[PDB]
Amino acid sequence: MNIGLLEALDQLEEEKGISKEEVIPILEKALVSAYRKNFGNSKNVEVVIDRNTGNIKVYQLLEVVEEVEDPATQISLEEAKKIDPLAEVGSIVKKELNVKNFGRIAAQTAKQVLIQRIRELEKEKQFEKYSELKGTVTTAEVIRVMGEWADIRIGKLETRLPKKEWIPGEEIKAGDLVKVYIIDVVKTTKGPKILVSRRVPEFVIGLMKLEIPEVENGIVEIKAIAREPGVRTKVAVASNDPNVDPIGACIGEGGSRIAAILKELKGEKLDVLKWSDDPKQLIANALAPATVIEVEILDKENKAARVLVPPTQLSLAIGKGGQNARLAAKLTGWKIDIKPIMNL
Numbered sequence: 025m026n027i028g029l030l031e032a033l034d035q036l037e038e039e040k041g042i043s044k045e046e047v048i049p050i051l052e053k054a055l056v057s058a059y060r061k062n063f064g065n066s067k068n069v070e071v072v073i074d075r076n077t078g079n080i081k082v083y084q085l086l087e088v089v090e091e092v093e094d095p096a097t098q099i100s101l102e103e104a105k106k107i108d109p110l111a112e113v114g115s116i117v118k119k120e121l122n123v124k125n126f127g128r129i130a131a132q133t134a135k136q137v138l139i140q141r142i143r144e145l146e147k148e149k150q151f152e153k154y155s156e157l158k159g160t161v162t163t164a165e166v167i168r169v170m171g172e173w174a175d176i177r178i179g180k181l182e183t184r185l186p187k188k189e190w191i192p193g194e195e196i197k198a199g200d201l202v203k204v205y206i207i208d209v210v211k212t213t214k215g216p217k218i219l220v221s222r223r224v225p226e227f228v229i230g231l232m233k234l235e236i237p238e239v240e241n242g243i244v245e246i247k248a249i250a251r252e253p254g255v256r257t258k259v260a261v262a263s264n265d266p267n268v269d270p271i272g273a274c275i276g277e278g279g280s281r282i283a284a285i286l287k288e289l290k291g292e293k294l295d296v297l298k299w300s301d302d303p304k305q306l307i308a309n310a311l312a313p314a315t316v317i318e319v320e321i322l323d324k325e326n327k328a329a330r331v332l333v334p335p336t337q338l339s340l341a342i343g344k345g346g347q348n349a350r351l352a353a354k355l356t357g358w359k360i361d362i363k364p365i366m367n368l
Contacts, residue, residue: 025131030078032138042141048073051137055080058133059126066096070118080130083118150181151216155209161230164220166200176204178218189221192254194290203288205230225251228259231288235281238263238273247299250354256293258310258351270298295351307331307360310352314341317365328359335364 033044055071059082068085087097088104088111104111111117164185167175173184174196185196185204196202204220205227221227229246238244243265251257261270274296275282286294297309307329308316314337320330333341341362342349353360 026127027079027131029073029080029134032134033078036138036141040142040145042145047137047141048075050141051134054133054137055082055130058129062129063123063126067121068097069121080126082121082123082126084121086117086119088115088117089113147215150179151209151211154179154181154206154216154218157206157218158209159206159226159230161203161205161227161234163201164204166196166198166202168198169196174198176202176220178204178220181216181218183218183220185220185222189223191222191290191292194222194254203227203231203234223253225249225257228257228285228289228294231285232259232274235284236274236276238265238268243268244270244273248355250351252347252351254292256295256347256351257289258295258297258312258355260297260299260306260309260355262299271296303327303356303358304329306356307352307358310355311341311360311362312348312352314348316341326359327357329361331360331362332365333362335367338362338364 033047036042036047037044052071052073055073056069059069059071070083070085072081072083073079074081085097086099086104088101089098090101090113091098092100099117101111101113104115104117107119108117162178164176164178166185167177167182169175171187173186174190176183176185185202190196190202202222204222205224207219207221207224207226209216209218228249228251232246233240236244239246239261243263245262245264246259247262248260249257250259261274263270263273282294282296286292295310295312297312300306300309304319304321307319308331311331311333314333317332317334320332322328322330331341340348343351349360349362
């Protein structure tokens with residue numbers, strides 16, 4: 025490809041919106057560089073791309089002085105006045121330098137520049153797309169794992185998934201494909217950077233949207249959630265469609281859906297329960313497998329209640345380290361106290 029510089033420039037400013045006035049200058053300076061690292065490094069040269077033809081012009085600069093110390097950089101006022109405009113000591117004087125064999129080189133450095141300009145446009149294009157992924161869950165590939173973070177890959181982009189943000193207790197190794205939640209996408213003065221987490225509660229929601237269509241749809245709504253990453257998540261759902269059972273849509277065909285969810289959560293426990301406008305029933309739904317007999321709303325004001333359960337389900341209702349009641353408490357917003365019936 026000969027010069028053909030104007031060629032691409034016009035095609036680019038129309039194919040990718042990149043202004044040629046932003047490129048010519050960057051290119052002109054790179055050409056001086058190319059001419060130097062290619063031809064001699066003796067002459068102080070300047071390069072100008074003709075805006076009507078794109079033909080590259082190359083001028084040798086010279087200081088018009090009163091001496092002859094360095095012919096290569098200086099010129100008397102008689103050698104100057106002549107060949108060039110009406111100079112004066114301490115002025116500009118550009119001798120054009122007809123010189124072939126540069127056409128080749130110039131083309132290459134032009135290619136480079138155009139590509140670097142494109143990569144920049146592309147970078148601004150990454151931020152556009154990937155911001156649309158904000159608030160969703162997407163699979164990512166773990167490139168490497170270092171102490172406090174793992175470098176993961178999402179599409180053409182790459183970010184860190186800090187260890188502080190992954191499931192407390194989990195292991196992640198290079199080559200792994202882990203799902204992450206996009207908190208936000210930010211424009212960093214070094215490419216767009218996607219903020220991700222597998223610990224945040226929206227992660228569980230994100231997973232549900234994937235494995236469960238009606239949740240992506242809206243046919244099954246997630247009314248409430250409470251998550252203690254690594255240990256347990258309780259999530260309350262409802263169907264905006266009385267034809268679909270919220271729970272059934274979540275458990276899935278032979279339980280393949282919570283199965284996929286649970287696996288992704290490693291050891292984390294997940295409780296899927298029906299939401300209810302009736303606090304007493306909500307609470308009862310939140311105490312998971314324990315069977316509640318009655319909820320005693322001893323404060324319809326400060327949202328506090330007493331729950332009575334069968335003796336043999338007292339510790340089950342409460343849970344290891346009391347995680348069941350605590351999580352049901354966070355999910356409902358009510359303070360709950362569990363008690364065995366008939367026996368103090």
